[PDB]
Write a protein that binds this ligand. Structure first.
Ligand SMILES: CCn1c2ccc(OC(C)C)cc2c2cc(C(=O)NCc3ccc(S(=O)(=O)CC)cc3)ccc21
Length: 259
């Protein structure tokens, strides 16, 4: 590429991210005073393990849906082959969400936006996966300290998705070319903005992997306890990405072709 082509890539990635923002950053910020009452938090903790999982899995899926749209509007993604498009989303959708999640996290009070209001990590006690939950909270605390801008979120999440070491890619070099061009864009924007210093403070990719593996390990435990809840009440797309052998659902392909 070239300088103008790189800056055009910066604007195109940032646009594609805004359009597929689930919630505008301002909407999330204006709600920061709206905090679950102690009584409301007690009600969350007393809900059954399997209903909490169903509600959270459904919210997770909604977020995942916006990440698919981001991909479809992202330069070069839709020129990749369908096998590679699915490998990328299958492995990176949960990662993009975990990163996007820091916009919904308030480090002042350590709360996360969820079902209309902000609550701390006790809100999630009914799930029986406190390690996962505190890892995600801590992970969102780390990212919140860097004070990402929205533009920086878009460029960074683009790279989280366009990761050419995902196993199973058929056109690895084509994904390499794309990844390298988004890296230059990201780094060009940080340099231009005097923000290269965040580069040494980004999470190792091994960390995003770790959280996703914890996600799936805890899903398998829950599914073994409530197999019929998963079969009858989890979102199909969620089963496709995360459960086993749940990928008999072909939702992603449907999503990727539907205009
Ligand atoms: C660690 C605590 N936590 C969860 C823990 C587990 C879990 O699912 C498992 C049960 C499978 C799901 C959640 C979960 C979901 C939300 C959520 O969706 N809030 C609504 C929202 C809407 C838009 C944005 S955004 O615009 O910033 C783009 C992402 C952010 C947030 C918040 C916290 C959560």
């Amino acid at each position: 590429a070239s300088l103008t082509e790189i800056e055009h890539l910066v604007q195109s990635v940032c646009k594609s991210y805004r359009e597929t923002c689930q919630l505008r950053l301002e909407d999330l910020l204006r709600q920061r005073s709206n905090i679950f009452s102690r009584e409301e938090v007690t009600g969350y903790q007393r809900k059954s393990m399997w209903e909490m999982w169903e509600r959270c899995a459904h919210h997770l899926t909604e977020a995942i849906q916006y990440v698919v749209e981001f991909a479809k509007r992202l330069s070069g993604f839709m020129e990749l082959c369908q096998n590679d498009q699915i490998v990328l989303l299958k492995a990176g959708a949960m990662e993009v969400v975990l990163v996007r999640m820091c916009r919904a996290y308030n480090a002042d009070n350590r709360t996360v936006f969820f079902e209309g209001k902000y609550g701390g990590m006790e809100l999630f006690r009914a799930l029986g996966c406190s390690e996962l939950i505190s890892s995600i909270f801590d992970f969102s605390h780390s990212l919140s300290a860097l004070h990402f801008s929205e533009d920086e979120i878009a460029l960074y999440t683009a790279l989280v998705l366009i990761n050419a070491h995902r196993p199973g890619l058929q056109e690895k070099r084509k994904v390499e070319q794309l990844q390298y061009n988004l890296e230059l864009a990201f780094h060009h924007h940080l340099c231009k903005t005097h923000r290269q210093s965040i580069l040494a403070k980004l999470p190792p990719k091994g960390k995003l992997r770790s959280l996703c593996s914890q996600h799936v390990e805890r899903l398998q435990i829950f599914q073994h306890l409530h197999p019929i809840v998963v079969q009858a009440a989890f979102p199909p797309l969620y089963k496709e990405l995360f459960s086993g052998g749940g990928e008999k659902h072909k939702i992603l392909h449907r999503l990727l072709q539907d205009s």
